[PDB]
Amino acid sequence: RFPAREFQRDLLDWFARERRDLPWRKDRDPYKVWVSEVMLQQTRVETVIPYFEQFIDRFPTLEALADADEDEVLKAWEGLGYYSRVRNLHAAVKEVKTRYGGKVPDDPDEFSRLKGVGPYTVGAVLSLAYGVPEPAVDGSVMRVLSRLFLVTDDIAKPSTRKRFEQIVREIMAYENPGAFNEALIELGALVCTPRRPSCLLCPVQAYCQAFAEGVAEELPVKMKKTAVKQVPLAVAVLADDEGRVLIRKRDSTGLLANLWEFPSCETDADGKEKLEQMVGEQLQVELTEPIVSFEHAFSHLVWQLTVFPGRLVHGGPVEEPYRLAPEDELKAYAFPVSHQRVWREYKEWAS
DNA sequence: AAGACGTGGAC
DNA sequence: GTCCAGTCT
Ligand code: SF4
Ligand SMILES: [Ca+2]
Ligand SMILES: [Ca+2]
Ligand SMILES: [Ca+2]
C-alpha cells in the first residue's frame, strides 16, 4: 500500500543532506545519547545545547554521573525544568553501574526497567547508539505520522502513540534503524513544523495524504489543555547582620523536589502573617512590607509570588531542612527559576 | 486515564 | 492569549 523503501530512501537521503551538527551527534556513545534524549524531553534543542555541554563537561562518563552527589547533578540541571528527569537519570545511571557494570543495556526490556526510561527513550537511545530497531515516537514523530497517513486519533491518548509505533514498525528501514528514527525527528523539527509546515520543500511530499487533502495545518489532533490553578505564594528573603541568608531544601517528593528555595507558604490570604508564624516553628523573625509581586508558570499551575524582606537574629541552631548561606555561596545551590527571580528582584531593590 | 511535573520560544 | 519543545502515578 505504502512504498516503504521509496519513502525510506527519500527521507534518509534528505537526512544525510540536512542533518544539523548537534553536540550529541558527534558520536553514538549510549551515555551521551541517553543524557541528550532525556534533556530533550519537553525541551527545545536551542535551550538544551548549553546544558548538555556543561553536563557532559562535569559528568563525562556514566560513572562520573553515578559517583556524583545528588546536589551537584541538580545544580547542573538548574533551570532546565522537570527535575525528576535528572533524579531518575542519576538513579538509573547508578543502577547501570551497580547492576550492569557501567554498560548501558542494549535489551529493550532490560533498559526500560531503568527509572525515567519510557517508550520514547528506549527507542531513541537503543536505535541510535546500538542499532536496535525499536520505534522512537515522540510528539514530533506523532505529528509527522498523523499527516503522512492522515491519522486523526487524539495523540494524547497512549493508544494513539502505540498505533504510530506500529506504523513505524511497518515502514521502518531495518537496515539503518537509528538513522530512520532520527530522520523522522529531524523531519519534524525542520520541515513538518507545528504551524505552517514547509511541505513544498518536504522530501516526502508525494507520500503525504494530508498534503494531498490540504489539511496538514489541521493536524495532529489533540485535546485542548486543562486550565491551570492559580496559587498565591509568600516568600521570605531573610538576612542577618553578617549578610547571610536563610534558604531551605524542598522535600524529595513532588513539586521542585530537592531544589533549594527561600522559605515560602501558600497563602490562600495573609502574607507577612502566615510567613512569620511558619519561620519560628522551624528563629525570631519579624517581617516588613513587600517589595514586588510577580507570576511564574508551571505546566499545571501558576505561582503568584510576593516577596517580603526581613531581618534575622540567631536565637538557636539552623535545623534541617534549613541552611544558613552567605550571599557569596548562594551561587552553589540550585534554585527554581521563580526563586532565582525572587533574589534578583530583592537584590535590585536593595540598591 | 488524567494529573503532576518547569521552562522558554514561536506563533 | 495558544501551542509545544515524555514519564511517573
Ligand atoms: S508533506 Fe507536509 S504535512 Fe506531509 S510530512 Fe511533509 S511537511 Fe509534513
Ligand atoms: Ca520503563
Ligand atoms: Ca520533538
Ligand atoms: Ca513533598
What one-character-per-residue DSSP string does A121-150 give?
A: HHHHHHHHHS--------HHHHHHHHHHTT
Buried b or exposed e, range A20-33, using 16+ CB within 10 angstroms: eeeebeeeebbbbb
How far is residue A275's CA from residue A295's CA, in Å, rounded to a whole number?
A: 18
- For A150, what's the count of Cα atoms within 13 Å in the CB-facing half-sphere? 11
Q: Are A235 and A42 in contact (CB under 8 A)?
A: no
Minimum CA distance residue for ligand 1 atom 1:
A205
Residues constituting chain A = 351
How far is residue A74's CA from residue A84's CA, in Å, rounded to a whole number?
A: 10
The experimental method, as deposited, was X-ray
Q: From the Cβ of A305, is strand B under 7 Å away? A: no
Q: List residues near ligand 1 (CB under 6 A).
A: A 144, 147-148, 191-192, 197, 199, 202, 204-205, 208, 210-211, 216
How far is residue A105's CA from residue A303's CA, in Å, rounded to a whole number?
A: 40
Ligand nearest to the CA of A201: 1
How far is residue A246's CA from residue A240's CA, in Å, rounded to a whole number?
A: 9
Residue A122: all three cell numbers together = 528506549
How far is residue A306's CA from residue A83's CA, in Å, rounded to a whole number?
A: 24
Chain position carrying cell 498534503: A211
What value, to the nearest 5°, has the Cα angle with vertex A126 and ends A178 and A100?
155
State the CB neighbour count (10 A cutoff) for residue A7.
Answer: 19
Q: Which nucleotide is nearest to A41 (CA to C1')?
A: C6
CA of A9 to C1' of B4 (A): 41
> What does each C-alpha distance from A351 to A142, A238, A347 come to in angstroms?
51, 16, 7
CA of A243 to C1' of C4 (A): 42
Q: At what angle do helices A30-39 and A119-129 cross, to 10 degrees?
A: 150
> What does each C-alpha distance from A325 to A25, A26, A291, A332 come to in angstroms?
40, 40, 22, 10
How far is residue A63's CA from residue A31's CA, in Å, rounded to a whole number?
A: 10
3-state secondary structure of A305: strand
Encoded amino acid at A65, one letter = L
- Helices and strands in chain A, H and E counts: 15, 8
Torsion of the alpha carbons at A17, A21, A27 and A28, rounded to the nearest 10: -70
Give the residue numbers of the binding site of A for [4Fe-4S] cluster: 192, 199, 202, 208
How far is residue A67's CA from residue A316's CA, in Å, rounded to a whole number?
A: 35
Asked if the bond preceding A321 is cis, omega within 30° of 0, the reply is: yes
For A191-266, where are the alpha helices, taking DSSP H only? 209-213
- For A257, what's the count of Cα atoms within 13 Å in the CB-facing half-sphere? 11
The residues spanned by each domain of chain A are 1-20+133-228, 21-132, 229-351
